[PDB]
Design a protein around this ligand. Structure first.
Ligand SMILES: *[C@@H]1O[C@H](CO[C@@H]2O[C@@H](C)[C@@H](O)[C@@H](O)[C@@H]2O)[C@@H](O)[C@H](O)[C@H]1NC(C)=O
Ligand SMILES: *[C@@H]1O[C@H](CO)[C@@H](O)[C@H](O)[C@H]1NC(C)=O
Ligand SMILES: CC(=O)SCC[N+](C)(C)C
Ligand SMILES: CC(=O)SCC[N+](C)(C)C
Ligand SMILES: CC(=O)SCC[N+](C)(C)C
Ligand SMILES: CC(=O)SCC[N+](C)(C)C
Ligand SMILES: CC(=O)SCC[N+](C)(C)C
Lengths: 533, 535
């Protein structure tokens, strides 16, 4: 019995497992329950705290993945399968994972809490790219990650109902945050220094905790990688959530109480089978069951909340990858595939814009096409393919990020911004997709430090830099190395200078203006257009 | 005759003329100035098409410039060369339909290609007698026969009650056409070749050239065309029949006046009364807009210039078109609060938004916002230097650059041989402030070769630059190709096409080929704003 692997938390005793990182051992406590299983009558309901347990709970293995849609586009292909569930699916999935140094920290250590993405319809804390051991071992970090409910199970809402009030997957996340405040000190973690970080829907989730008062007492800093609470996909209105839940019920053969009661009888896969059938248009980067503007978790729209919020005591790190949109094009836009160059016609570009900007009117779509066409090369398939990616990336991630960065800065927050421009040497998606959505994560988590994974020496050195920025941010709210001189420093993002950095194999380079002209199109003009028309 | 210079006596259809020997720097040229080409359009003839001049008896003295057509005279900056150089330099009169001819001295012995100049001035002003339109350098140095005519401007040239007999519209264009007919019949008497006539003009003169391209009876009267900083299409060069009628009717009311009865009453008014009220009829507070301009009458213009350039067959056409670096800047001090020639005109964002309503006067609120958003530098949205320069760009692009881009594209797509330039040299002697850059009109003095006159104080490099330009323009006149058929060593000027969109920089440096005439921004003005308009 290794006493470093025995911890007493409020619910009882746990036994962890010693894992081997390249530089040495780490302690892992995996599959720790933070809620009562949300099964049976508890489906669609807020999470309840986990009851205490007898004896020593085995926390040596990852628990089940929350029940979800499994991707089938490219069976056996690593680029898609690396995101698919890697443990059995179950509604009984409300567990979290903690990595710490071995031996455990002698003094209170800054905590990083990871919230995974997956469109609010997928994801798991057990994926290889979210492996917290490198950060634990190399940077001495205490790293936590939780499973939260996704799809109908996490986000189906009949707003105003007792039995399906909405946003319960976010409440799962919050309960895990409360768990950390109550228990993380037992692992050597510092509850007075907690940094949330996440990517895509996970980043949107972090943003929602920034915008919801009860969460604000549970953390001190935030990192939003490639996602935001504002923007076209992260939230729905109460009316649209109700429509979707009501249509789904209809499709599976089902007064809110009666409707929700019948949905609770349905096998989990019956719900998932119809998950994608309730979206209002044919689209990409759109997800059926997402956080809802309920007037409770979210007191108003994220747009409203970011415009009027006071963010003076907040430090935030935000950014994007170079090719945010490319991934999504193979899931809906004719002409696109991983298995060829996806050189498209102008006709295919105009068709794709309707799918990539599915809420756009004819005129708005026309403006998108006119803005993104290179009028020197208006029919060039390479330009048109790359423009399609840009439209989807900018509409869904880059311009929402720019908007958030600007508002948070204007309203007193300390903001740092980046663009991530390095394509992993071992990437299995084609060259044309560039640096796609999701492919900074393996570097931030430090995977290239494992020589068995076949990254280059330069990628290992780059990962070590990134882990340092992130953990320095965790320690101080400033990603710069506190001892260590050398220009260039990473300056805060401001509305005046709009400074951000490129994260690639070259030294930090400071740039100004995050797609400034194009995001003015999306953030200023298109709103004026559809409010008038 | 008997004691006079025998090399200056010429007969035309209306009778005998006596010209004058002028000194150009390289030698003598012949000038026949103030030749009448129409009956004076006075009295009962006001607003009416021109009638051919009746023959005269004896020798007509053609040694001086004739009257300038009655027009508004700029008072913005009294005494200032930058404005006064465009003001009338002879007596204002409605008796003004005269033309000028310059030729080598002695006159050429074999038929010589002819260049015909049509001046600009917003269709409300201008004169063929201005110093910058002096044909002596082209005639002396390039051996050109150069012709320039006065044409009626303002109400006198362009007031229309469409469908009426007494004020049918477009009479200033008909004045131009009659001068072109005069050249066909008479220019051989001077050694000019009626089978090689090239029209060239700037601003409204360029617009006029374009309307001759688009009007059937003009097409037999010339062979090639040059449009400098102006087009027949675009927001200022034409009005609809209904708008012309509205303006004519309002003007009549303002001066105290059934179309016959209305026009009869307008014919009783002093010319100056019409001039004094002509600015009062524009529908908005605006710049780069003019009250009395060509009308889409279904006659001279059978359809809008837009329609005609979209459907026309221009296979037999060769055209040279282009713009200066700062088309808009001039106009800002005539209407946009915050702008002046006597300070740097650094403006606020508020003054930029206000300016956009004045510079894009027909724009709805949404379109104006589209413009502001496009032209704002979102890295420096409040910087007064960028805002000033953006105000200029808005007005230049909207009114000249994007209309030219549109014209060059349609013409090339529909069979024309098109050559395109941007002129980027600022005259060393320019009296307008530096912030205005290379303003509208300030290429002309170089095309006409004024720097060849040492008394004018241009630089040596400016002289060499002028000589190149005159070569380009005259080579184009001669052959439909501005390139020298000898000189393969000099860089070549490629035709503008829709595929490659090539055009050249005209400056002190050897020709540089560039691609795309404001391609992205002109997509906004020419493809997006029109689609917005439809709803
Ligand atoms: C630039 O000038 C604009 C026009 O005002 C005229 O010129 C200036 C220099 C004054 O002498 C004034 O009396 C004239 O009427 C002004 O609107 C503008 O404010 C001036 N720019 C600045 C701030 O110096
Ligand atoms: C040319 O320069 C001289 C000498 O300074 C000056 O007197 C004359 O007025 C200038 N000529 C012109 C055309 O301005
Ligand atoms: C199951 C997986 O994560 S695939 C491994 C891809 N990686 C080593 C480049 C992150
Ligand atoms: C709890 C564990 O260690 S699972 C195996 C994870 N690995 C594939 C990244 C090594
Ligand atoms: C494209 C998607 O929405 S899922 C892919 C996995 N990821 C989002 C977590 C990176
Ligand atoms: C009356 C005039 O033309 S003054 C301008 C003279 N300049 C064009 C040679 C500078
Ligand atoms: C409407 C005007 O711009 S008048 C200025 C003189 N110019 C046009 C002939 C150069």
């Amino acid at each position: 019995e290794d006493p470093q692997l025995l911890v007493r938390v409020r619910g009882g005793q746990l036994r962890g497992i010693r894992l081997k990182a390249p530089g040495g051992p780490v302690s892992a406590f995996l599959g720790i329950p933070f809620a009562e299983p949300p099964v049976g009558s508890r489906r669609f309901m807020p999470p309840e705290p986990k009851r205490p347990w007898s004896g020593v709970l085995d926390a040596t293995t990852f628990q089940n993945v929350c029940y979800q849609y499994v991707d089938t586009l490219y069976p056996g292909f690593e680029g898609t399968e690396m995101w698919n569930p890697n443990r059995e699916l179950s509604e009984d999935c409300l567990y979290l994972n903690v990595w710490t140094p071995y031996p455990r920290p002698a003094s209170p250590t800054p905590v990083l809490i990871w919230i995974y993405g997956g469109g609010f319809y997928s994801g798991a804390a057990s994926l290889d790219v979210y492996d917290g051991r490198f950060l634990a071992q190399v940077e001495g970090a205490v790293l936590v990650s939780m499973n939260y409910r996704v799809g109908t199970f996490g986000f189906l809402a009949l707003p105003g109902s007792r039995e399906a009030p909405g946003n319960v997957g976010l409440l799962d996340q919050r309960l895990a945050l409360q768990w950390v405040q109550e228990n993380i000190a037992a692992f050597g973690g510092d509850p007075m220094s907690v940094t949330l970080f996440g990517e895509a829907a996970g980043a949107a989730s972090v943003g929602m905790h920034i915008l919801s008062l009860p969460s604000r007492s549970l953390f001190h800093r935030a990192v939003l990688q490639s996602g935001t609470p504002n923007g076209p996909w992260a939230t729905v209105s109460a009316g649209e959530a109700r429509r979707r839940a009501t249509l789904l019920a209809r499709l599976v053969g089902c007064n809110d109480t009666e409707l929700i009661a019948c949905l609770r009888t349905r096998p989990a896969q019956d719900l998932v089978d119809h998950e994608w059938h309730v979206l209002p248009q044919e689209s990409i980067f759109r997800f059926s069951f997402v956080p809802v503007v309920d007037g409770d978790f979210l007191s108003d729209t994220p747009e409203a909340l970011i415009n009027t919020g006071d963010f003076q005591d907040l430090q935030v790190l935000v950014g994007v990858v170079k090719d945010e949109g490319s991934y999504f094009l193979v899931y809906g836009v004719p002409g696109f595939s991983k298995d060829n160059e996806s050189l498209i016609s102008r006709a295919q570009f105009l068709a794709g814009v309707r799918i990539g900007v599915p809420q756009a009117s004819d005129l708005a779509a026309e403006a998108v096409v006119l803005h993104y066409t290179d009028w020197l090369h208006p029919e060039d398939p390479t330009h048109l393919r790359d423009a399609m990616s840009a439209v989807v990336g900018d509409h869904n991630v880059v311009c929402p990020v720019a908007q958030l960065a600007g508002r948070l800065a204007a309203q007193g927050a300390r903001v740092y911004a980046y663009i991530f421009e390095h394509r992993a040497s071992t990437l299995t998606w084609p060259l044309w997709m560039g640096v796609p959505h999701g492919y900074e994560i393996e570097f931030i988590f430090g995977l290239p430090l494992d020589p068995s994974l076949n990254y280059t020496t330069e990628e290992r050195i780059f990962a070590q830099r990134l882990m340092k920025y992130w953990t320095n941010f965790a320690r101080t709210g400033d990603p710069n190395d506190p001892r260590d001189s050398k220009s260039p420093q990473w300056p805060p993002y401001t509305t005046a200078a709009q400074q951000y950095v490129s994260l690639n194999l070259k030294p930090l380079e400071v740039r100004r203006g995050l797609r400034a002209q194009t995001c003015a199109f999306w953030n200023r003009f298109l709103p004026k257009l559809l409010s008038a028309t």
